[PDB]
Amino acid sequence: MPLHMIPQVAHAMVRAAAAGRLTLYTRTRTETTNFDHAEYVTCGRYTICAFCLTTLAPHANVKTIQDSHACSRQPNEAIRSLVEVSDKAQTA
């Protein structure tokens, strides 16, 4: 799984983010809590990889850019978490 129809499946990803439940899983650790670029975000079978923004495999062994891929979706991460939060516990 190399990603196809990129902007759309991206769409979908983000829709999971927007409704809090996004499977944000880097190798061993279940959520990309800290900014350690995910490996498996289940976009209806499409395992999204934050490592490359693409899927399954990282772009390089340059953990700086790879994390940067991650950092890029700082909006996605933040929204996901945030929506979870609000839809659980928030501003009294």
């Binding site: 979908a12 829709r15 999971a16 409704a19 439940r21 289940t42 976009c43 209806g44 079978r45 499409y46």
Partner: protein, 639 residues
């Protein structure tokens, strides 16, 4: 050359004179050779026979020239020659090549290998150089590309009122034709600039056509160029349509027999997959109303148990609700390697009356347990329920819901069924279902589940085709016989003996229909192969008065056309249980073999019926063409 705009010119299209040119020639590699490269006894006198060095490849002296290739090639040059006056006028390097000049003397030893060549010396023959052929070809190609506009233009004319009477003979005022041509034809044509040339050429190619008025005395002739020869072979005879035709046709049939290698069918005991199997395609099966009894890889769980509430996701629940005919259990326990292409559309059928309408998806779940399905009564049993196939596993109203409809949008699901992933042992199952996170009311939605669409097995692993659930390196046609119900066949994986055999069998049929006159009720001697097997088989002798069967020859013969005809009409019947006499593989072996001999030494089969009919239709065609031309004569009686 003669003024085209003259009188005396015949417009006689005849069968005898069927247009032809030289459109393309044979250039098969095999065919290029003949043969021996030319060599020398080192270079010293007649002593060194033991040793040869090839002549001067350097810039000249090569091999003994291909007799056929020379002859062919010279012919090719003659095509261009057909337009010589025109080339010349176009100033386009017209000068007729004279191939012969290229074909230069080679003198010494002839052979393929030094080996062979040592033995044979051939004094003062001919070679051609790589270089030379390079430059020769170059010229010819160039010539062709110069004519490419001309050819087209010539063609247009020849169709714009087509001089082609394939059958018999037509005649009409050429003048009339010609003048209407020039009254109707587009100005932008090369034909209108070059009338005189085009016509000349035409005349030179089409013996069917005569010059204007050159000597109005004698505008017409019976001797034309070479053409003629080739034409006689395309012209319809007393007993056959086309000689080339029937010859070609039959030869295509042979060669397909050749490629099949016959033997294929007469295989009981292991014939290797790779050998028997060509190229394979995916197939499409249903859950729905498939039959557990028949369907090896796809059976069902049985009513009564009830495995209702199962956790599906993180603290999220769906009632798989296992009881009365819950979709199907896809038995992918070492059933080759496939991709479970689930193609859901239509079917959604919203939960009974649950506000769990949103969050419910068409999904695939594989079940991975050492507890055989019939034992699976509680949650404990399952081992593994793995939801494989859902993607975004929530929901949206993809159903055409506006007008009340519960049509679900077309989904494409994938489950990479690689048996290596699991390697057996916790035997492999899968189910189909509208799976939810959002908890479903078990009491409410009493239906187990009704996710009924398509399941398009992708048999990826063209390696090692299955004989009836048996993953074998063997394809055994003759034993497949009478061991398959229609249901079974339908059910069967793509990767399975049955379809492969039919594909091969379809080529046999093809042959039979085109070549042997098994068309509308023609019982021919050709059909004798099957009857001879039948005749000997019927030797039902008892004591006293044995079977009083008035000899096989009418009786069985007619029965055997009938069953041939049934084979022909649908090839699969061969594989289908309970077919009177084809159930006997002997007869199919007999047919298979039989045909080839029948092609081989058949005295070129031309059905009497069809002859007469073709004759008649042909004539009537010509009539109406005449009448057309007549109308053209009427509307512009050109000069």
């Amino acid at each position: 050359t003669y003024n085209i705009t003259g009188d005396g010119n015949s417009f006689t299209p005849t069968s005898d004179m069927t247009s032809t040119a030289a459109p393309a020639i044979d250039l098969k590699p095999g065919v290029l050779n003949p043969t021996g490269k030319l060599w020398r006894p080192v270079g010293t006198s007649v002593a060194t026979i033991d040793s040869l060095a090839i002549v001067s490849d350097r810039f000249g002296q090569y091999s003994f020239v291909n007799e056929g290739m020379r002859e062919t090639f010279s012919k090719a040059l003659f095509d261009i020659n057909m337009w010589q006056p025109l080339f010349q006028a176009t100033k386009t390097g017209c000068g007729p090549i004279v191939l012969s000049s290229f074909t230069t003397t080679t003198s010494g030893y002839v052979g393929a290998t030094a080996g062979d060549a040592l033995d044979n010396p051939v004094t003062n023959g001919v070679f051609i150089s790589t270089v030379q052929i390079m430059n020769l070809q170059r010229t010819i190609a160039a010539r062709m590309r110069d004519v490419a506009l001309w050819q087209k233009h010539l063609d247009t004319a020849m169709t714009m009122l087509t001089p082609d009477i394939s059958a018999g003979s037509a005649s009409c005022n050429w003048k009339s034709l010609l003048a209407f041509a020039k009254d109707i034809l587009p100005l932008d044509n090369l034909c209108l600039t070059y009338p005189n040339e085009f016509y000349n050429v035409a005349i030179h190619r089409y013996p069917a056509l005569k010059p204007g008025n050159p000597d109005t005395k004698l505008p017409d002739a019976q001797a034309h160029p070479l053409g003629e020869v080739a034409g006689a072979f395309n012209a319809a005879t007393s007993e056959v349509g086309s000689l080339v035709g029937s010859s070609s046709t039959l030869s295509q049939a042979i060669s397909t027999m050749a490629g099949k290698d016959l033997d294929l069918i007469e295989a009981d005991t292991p014939l290797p997959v790779s050998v028997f199997t060509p190229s394979l395609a995916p197939r499409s099966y249903r859950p729905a109303f498939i039959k557990p009894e028949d369907a090896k890889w796809i059976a069902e769980f049985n009513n009564s148990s009830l495995i209702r509430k199962t956790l599906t996701y993180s603290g999220a629940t769906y009632t798989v609700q296992l009881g009365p005919g819950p979709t199907r259990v896809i038995d992918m326990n070492a059933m080759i390697d496939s991709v479970l292409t689930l193609d859901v559309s239509g079917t959604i059928l919203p939960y009974d009356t649950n506000p769990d309408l949103s969050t419910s998806v068409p999904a695939f779940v594989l079940i991975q347990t050492s507890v055989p399905i019939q034992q699976v009564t509680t949650a404990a049993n399952i081992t593994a329920i793995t939801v494989v196939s859902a993607a975004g596993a929530s929901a949206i109203n993809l159903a055409i819901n506006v007008r009340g409809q519960p049509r679900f949008n077309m989904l494409h699901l994938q489950a990479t069924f690689e048996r290596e992933t699991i390697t057996g042992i916790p035997y492999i199952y899968g189910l189909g279902t509208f799976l939810i996170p959002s908890p479903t009311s078990s009491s409410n939605f009493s239906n187990p589940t009704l996710m009924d669409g398509l399941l398009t097995v992708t048999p990826v692993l063209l390696r090692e085709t299955t004989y009836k659930g048996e993953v074998v390196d063997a394809i055994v046609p003759a034993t497949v016989m009478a061991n398959q119900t229609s249901e079974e066949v339908a059910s069967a994986l793509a990767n399975d003996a049955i379809v492969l055999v039919s594909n091969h069998l379809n080529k046999l049929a093809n042959v039979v229909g085109d070549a042997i006159p098994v068309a509308s009720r023609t019982d021919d001697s050709a059909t004798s192969a099957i009857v001879s097997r039948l005749a000997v088989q019927h030797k039902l002798s008892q004591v006293g008065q044995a079977s009083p069967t008035p000899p096989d020859y009418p009786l069985l013969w007619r029965r055997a056309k009938r069953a041939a005809s049934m084979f022909v009409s649908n090839p699969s019947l061969a594989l289908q249980v309970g077919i009177p006499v084809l159930t006997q593989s002997g007869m199919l072996s007999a047919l298979t073999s039989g045909v080839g001999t029948a092609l081989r030494t058949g005295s070129l089969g031309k059905g009497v019926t069809d002859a007469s009919e073709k004759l008649r239709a042909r004539q009537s065609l010509t009539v109406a063409k005449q009448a057309f031309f007549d109308q053209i004569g009427s509307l512009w009686p050109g000069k």
